[PDB]
Amino acid sequence: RIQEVDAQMLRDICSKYFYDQCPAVAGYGPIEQLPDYNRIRSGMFWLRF
């Protein structure tokens, strides 16, 4: 099952699960510079794609 993975299906699966999704964030400690959720949600996609 490992040997059947190439780059094409890797970026297909990663565009399925990572690209333009809504993440769950958990911060603890001095997290004032941790960005607001709209910044992470904007970081989940590229405008160059």
Partner 1 sequence: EFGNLARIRHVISYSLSPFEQRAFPSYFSKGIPNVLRRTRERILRVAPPFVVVYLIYTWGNQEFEQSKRKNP
CB of 12 to partner 1, least distance (A): 23
Structure tokens at 10: 């890797």
Q: Which of 43, 42, 25 is CA-nearest to residue 34?
A: 25
Nearer to partner 1, 9 or 19 (CB): 19
Would you count residue 30 as binding partner 1 (CB under 8 A)?
yes
Q: Which of 9, 48, 42 is CA-nearest to residue 1?
A: 9
Kindly determine how many residues on this chain lie close enough to bind partner 1 according to the rule CB under 8 A.
7
Footprint of partner 1 (CB under 8 A): 22, 30, 32-33, 37-38, 41
